[PDB]
Design a protein around this ligand. Structure first.
Ligand SMILES: Nc1ncnc2c1ncn2[C@@H]1O[C@H](COP(=O)(O)OP(=O)(O)O)[C@@H](O)[C@H]1O
Ligand SMILES: Nc1ncnc2c1ncn2[C@@H]1O[C@H](COP(=O)(O)OP(=O)(O)O)[C@@H](O)[C@H]1O
Ligand SMILES: Nc1ncnc2c1ncn2[C@@H]1O[C@H](COP(=O)(O)OP(=O)(O)O)[C@@H](O)[C@H]1O
Ligand SMILES: Nc1ncnc2c1ncn2[C@@H]1O[C@H](COP(=O)(O)OP(=O)(O)O)[C@@H](O)[C@H]1O
Ligand SMILES: Nc1ncnc2c1ncn2[C@@H]1O[C@H](COP(=O)(O)OP(=O)(O)O)[C@@H](O)[C@H]1O
Lengths: 375, 375, 375, 375, 375
């Protein structure tokens, strides 16, 4: 609180907002992106509740609330709800006066121009920021990495991409999309557990299943052989206590759930699994740069956090590639916050501080400015 | 760095610049003559790239870049690009201060007067050389050889010539031209490999094919009989690993590609093959000097480097010449740098140091001087 | 069904089989070339479905099926699938007994010898044809045209060529290739529509987008000026009802999609647009025949069907050619079936009936016969 | 078509056949003497072309064809090709039945006896002429002129001669030969235009250059002074449109090309220029007849058609001859057909009709007859 | 190198210089008399050539050089060139210091007084000889012979004479001249070989033809009968390999060429053949000395070297002379050097050493002295 200034790095996630100050090593505020007020709301004797805050309160308030994601699949679809999320971010989580900070916002891949313009309009008109930037989330991640060359497999919450990069450039024609990512894997685990006679269907039960997924699932060494071991499997049958206190047993569901990344037909997806899309992406590049891609396969995103994933990707890529090809899979430790960190590096870039968009630019060429000939 | 001085010998090739110091046995700097910057250029997060350097970086940077040759067919056609190549030569490759060195430049056969004048203007005005010479590349080669008499077959990258020489003089009416040389053979190998179901069409793929040509092609003992052996040929089917790691098999393409020098109709050229042009050149000379030409057929240029070429030329010339004629084919070992070496000998000629062109001559009779009544 | 005989004209297209009887004015059978069976196949209560028929059933059966093209890029790559397509052609579409009809088959440019031999082997051994011919598809088209001289621009589904022709001969060195054609334009329209927030990614969605392309796209008068008019464009914003019944609006995507033929960099292609390849092809011919080429530029192929294409080509060629050059663009009305019609003319050529290949020739010199010294 | 008869006057030129009926004022048929069929011949879909007709078709068919002259340097060297030229002459150009017409044929200077005998054998055995004569082409020209005395400079297509004549007799020891004539000047113009960066090397390009030569070249008033005016020459820089439509500029090449007749060293010829050979020829005659030669210098042949040639020859001869010598240069208007006209006069000579050679003479003393003791 | 002294005998021939020391049996130095430097001279890379040496170098250097004879027809016409020939003679061929040797020079018949004076001036002023003599070449030959009486037929290179001699005196009125000799016969053989379709026109080709003449020509026994035998002549058709290696066949040209000495009308000469001039010379002498002439006909000169010439001259003279006349033809073996040998005898004549001309005589009565009242 003086001269200088930082850069409000707000990564608008499909399920979680990550926000903080440029220059910090990780976001200081992480809260669910949802909207929820009592679904039954039966009055009582007073009030003192906040209608649709969701954020952190919701979670801990599981069972009372309803949820909505105004950013459900990564694109913002409800501007009144999004204004509530940004107000919460600035005033309740970070506890800042937004008019004192240049703010860098992230946007999903393929975000419409008109959507970026509405984001810009709200920042300047509603929150009175002195400036702002919009950055592409994949791009920020790439930034955080620091690798000019290599092929990234980025699997997050709602989408997975394979992005080959040569000298810093995402050759746009190589990238392929997959709908599936963690949101789909949590829904599939709810369904397969419901196969055993359990019942996980409510909003609260979804949260419970997301926790089972993140704590007990793993990727097999070989799907077929893991299924065969399931028979005499005395390991798989882990126990998990529900908040009600009942204890369920989870066995082959531990590896059947994430097997979907390699076999999208488990959820009905025709798409090619992540090892096939990696190969298909490398084959859309020049033959010449393929050796550099094969030796620099970088994993990113929350859904690449499973133990065993790098070794499995090494095995599968080795099976598809030429016999003399050197293959290397890199996974950065704390991948998931790779998107926020790239934003932090960019926003905290004094040297490129002219890329931030300003109140004068917005007034001159409206918000589009932050879209036409920059970010 | 003292008195005396050397002579900047810069051989401006259609595909490669050869440059160094007069008196060295070979050029110290050899780099592709091209211009290229990112064809897709997708920004990123910083810079630190050099726009259109090409030189050596390009090659190793295959797939990102585009190429241009400002000297595509041997004549310089873009002076802003050529200034970049000469700046790279002096400051980045040789690491010299050009104002300290007389510089000998080479020029293609049939280079327009106005082109030699523009070369001269740039050397004096842009690089401030103390002097300079322009030399004819064929001539330099001839110089390097050291043979006063004989008929040279010089096949390089973009052109092939037959030059009969009697007492040091190129009888200008005997020389014949051929468009075809190595540039054409690389393009033809790309095309014939594409016949087998492979696809070699990009800039990067051209470089790959140039490597296959230089490592695996050869000239047959007899074209017709080699084609007949192709059937039960278990030798021809060599393997070559692409940078992508795939392995292709090359068979009759190994000798079909260079067969074009003897049969220009393979690429649609009406011209007479190199054995016919040799004979036609000797027959435009006096009958009397023909015995000296037949016994001194000297091969020069990169495209004469194929194993077997001297024996094939001996066989073909013997078949066309009178039965009692003594025929000898000479091939100098490291032919290709024959052009640079001749320049080095000339430029490093203290005794003929008055042939260098000077800043006073350029100022007096402009650059033309280095054209009218000298080189 | 008597003496005489016709000629089974089967044009094996990358996406569509065109087949019929020699002498008919157009093919009587046109069906998608694909292979597809239920991707989910969930049993039920009976059967009565045909595993991978594709043909016409598929289309109308959109959403259930998967697709494969055994001729994806014009070259046949799966012989068991191709045998199914030919069986369907003969027995289900034409309803003929193949052993009663000489059959002319078409093949893609650059089809390997061994591939033509396998086509021949199947016709004689599997279908017992009395004879057969293999014809080159471009050639058949040329045949259908009837023009000895002129430069053809042929843009079809998977490839576009510029072919200069003087007295009936395709000067092979003039022709240039382009990967792009209609298959690429449909993929690019799916991608650009997905930019607006729509989602066209499935096999069924590809078919939907191919229909939007064929019904609503057009080529601009000038790309730059059309983009500028897009702003106040109240015309462009056509509506299109999806099979789900939702209605999308299509605007600048109508002309951005086919702009790719003139600007291949829109899909990442370095290649030169079709006006540049036309000029480059004419410049590889003798100067003398150029006036005949400029006055006989013939358009062929499905991707040349856009309204406005001839006028745009006239404008662009006029801008590149000498000022006194007479330029004429010819487009034959029903171009697309130009390939089948040329086959029909050839196959129905009683006078050249000796070019058909026979069961005795195949038995004597195997199938190669239909390759070595004929078609 | 009745009694009487004319005389088939066929002048077998190195580049053009001139043929017609004795008594006509000029030949009715003039066509290139060449042989050419498709050099690439790529089949197609039919035929209807004539293999190696050349004649007129070739020219108009420039770029497809190859050429051969069976009479390249004036002497017939291929009898199967010559039979094709004579068949074309009789049946396609003149449309006559050769067995109805005595035919006079011309032959080059120094034609071997055996060659005249083979010409005679073909006329009688192949074409069944009733008679024939062979005439010496120079002689026919002399005949056409009508001058008994004077020195002729005859410059045609492949040769130039100086022939002093006193009372009708060519004093054989005075005549001198020069290789150079129009064929050489066209080749030299191709070469010098290629010096400016143009490229004229193909058969079609040779025809183009022959047209530039015949339409735009001229002989200078003084070579040295014309070169000096070239600097500020704003006239010379004429424009010429190529069939491709490009426009080239021609300047000093307009007079440098024909300067070769006066300076044969421009093409490497040691020979003395045409003014020196004229003087050298007059000095090999008696001193006494020199005054008659100096006052009757007659120009003949196509290469004497340049505007300015008579005035230049007057100037140069005046400079070499004694000061009191009366010098006169005569140039007949339509010189080039001077050879055919002399043949027409001779052949149409009823009074000397006994000089024609007959079928009985050929049968008696073979063809030689038309050689031994006549023509 | 001591007292005494020899006499520099330099025979200045029209084509060959013969020089040596008086008293030697034959000249030690024989070299072509010519002047020649590169006709094309195209620079190169150095020098080390001698501009117009000609001498021996020329010959062996055939094709590069030009020729000039400063003594073309026997009379010296260029004194700067002649000084070069004499310098070469003294310093390069004989390797003498001319100031140490009295030098005898030969001169052609009818050499002008002023020419002999200029020869004398050069010897004394340029070469500082101590003395010199000028001798008449015919005279020297006569001297070498040793016959006081008889009629000599002397046929050399540029002239042929018939000289009747009675008691040592050439009766000047009897002698007759002929232009023709070997120079003419070589030119005529070039022309007649060019009749068969060969082409011998250059300086190098002249040298080749001179060799064919000297190795294969001969004089017939009877011209008419030799021509008649030519038909079934299987002998005449000798082969001769050209330096280019081609092989020509020579037949009746072997005797047609030298037939010109007996029939000068073959080259257009009106003159009477050598047998007629012999008879005409004898008839201009007294009747009384004719018997001595008829019995002493001595042949001399290079052109009398043909085998068969003495027998033919015996036959022809017998046919013209009275029936009882004794006729004898003498031919000295090595006739050609008869001119040099006579000079050697004279110059080496101690007894007549007072006839040498001295530096004092030249200074007193200038050079004329060696002309007025001596030689
Ligand atoms: N340790 C982990 N193991 C497996 N999945 C994880 C882990 N940590 C986070 N995830 C999952 O990763 C997803 C969030 O990843 P993220 O890269 O932030 O996605 P996005 O950027 O698409 O919002 C959620 O589905 C979450 O459950
Ligand atoms: N060993 C080799 N075998 C065959 N071709 C070769 C070899 N080395 C070089 N070349 C070829 O020679 C050509 C370069 O020859 P060069 O004489 O330098 O040509 P230029 O002087 O016309 O630029 C290139 O086409 C190159 O591929
Ligand atoms: N009216 C049309 N307008 C634009 N494209 C068309 C039209 N009709 C057909 N096409 C396209 O033309 C292509 C098929 O053309 P065709 O010449 O048959 O190709 P190929 O021979 O390469 O299989 C398909 O991409 C199709 O969508
Ligand atoms: N008007 C002209 N000006 C200059 N050259 C001409 C002209 N007309 C014809 N020629 C040339 O004259 C030559 C033909 O002359 P011609 O006397 O017929 O030769 P030849 O008899 O040796 O065949 C050709 O080289 C042609 O280009
Ligand atoms: N063996 C020979 N047969 C025929 N001619 C010969 C022979 N030897 C020399 N000659 C010719 O004789 C001529 C030279 O004779 P020479 O008496 O020296 O002449 P000159 O004195 O007139 O110079 C040359 O033409 C040469 O070719």
């Amino acid at each position: 609180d003086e001269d200088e200034t930082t850069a409000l790095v707000c990564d608008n996630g499909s399920g979680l907002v990550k926000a903080g100050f440029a220059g910090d090593d990780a976001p200081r505020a992480v809260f669910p992106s949802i909207v929820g007020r009592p679904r039954h709301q039966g009055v009582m004797v007073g009030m003192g509740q906040k209608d649709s805050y969701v954020g952190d309160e919701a979670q801990s308030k599981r069972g009372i609330l309803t949820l909505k994601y105004p950013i459900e699949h990564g694109i913002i679809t409800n501007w009144d709800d999004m204004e509530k999320i940004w107000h919460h971010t600035f005033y309740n989580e970070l506890r800042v006066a937004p008019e004192e900070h240049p703010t860098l916002l992230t946007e999903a891949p393929l975000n419409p121009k008109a959507n970026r313009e509405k984001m810009t309009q709200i920042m300047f008109e509603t929150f009175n920021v002195p400036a702002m930037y919009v950055a592409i989330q994949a791009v920020l991640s790439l930034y955080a990495s620091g690798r000019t060359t290599g092929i990234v497999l980025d699997s997050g919450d709602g989408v997975t991409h394979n992005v080959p990069i040569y000298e810093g450039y995402a050759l746009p024609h190589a990238i392929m999309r997959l709908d599936l990512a963690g949101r789909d894997l949590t829904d599939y685990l709810m369904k397969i557990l419901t196969e055993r006679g359990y019942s996980f269907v409510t909003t609260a039960e979804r949260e419970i299943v997301r926790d089972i997924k993140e704590k007990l699932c793993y990727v097999a060494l070989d799907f077929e052989n893991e299924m065969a071991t399931a028979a005499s499997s005395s390991s798989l049958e882990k126990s998990y206590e529900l908040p009600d206190g009942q204890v369920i047993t989870i066995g082959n569901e531990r590896f059947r759930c994430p097997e979907t990344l390699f076999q999208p037909s488990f959820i009905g997806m025709e798409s090619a699994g992540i090892h096939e899309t990696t190969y298909n992406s490398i084959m859309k590049c020049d033959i010449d740069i393929r050796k550099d891609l094969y030796a620099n396969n970088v994993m990113s995103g929350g859904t690449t956090m499973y133990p065993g994933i790098a070794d499995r990707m090494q095995k599968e890529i080795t099976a598809l590639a030429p016999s003399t090809m050197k293959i290397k899979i890199i996974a950065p430790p704390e991948r998931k916050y790779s998107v926020w960190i790239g934003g932090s590096i960019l926003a905290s870039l004094s040297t490129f501080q002219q890329m931030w968009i300003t109140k004068q630019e917005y007034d001159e060429a409206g918000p589009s400015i932050v879209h036409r000939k920059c970010f």
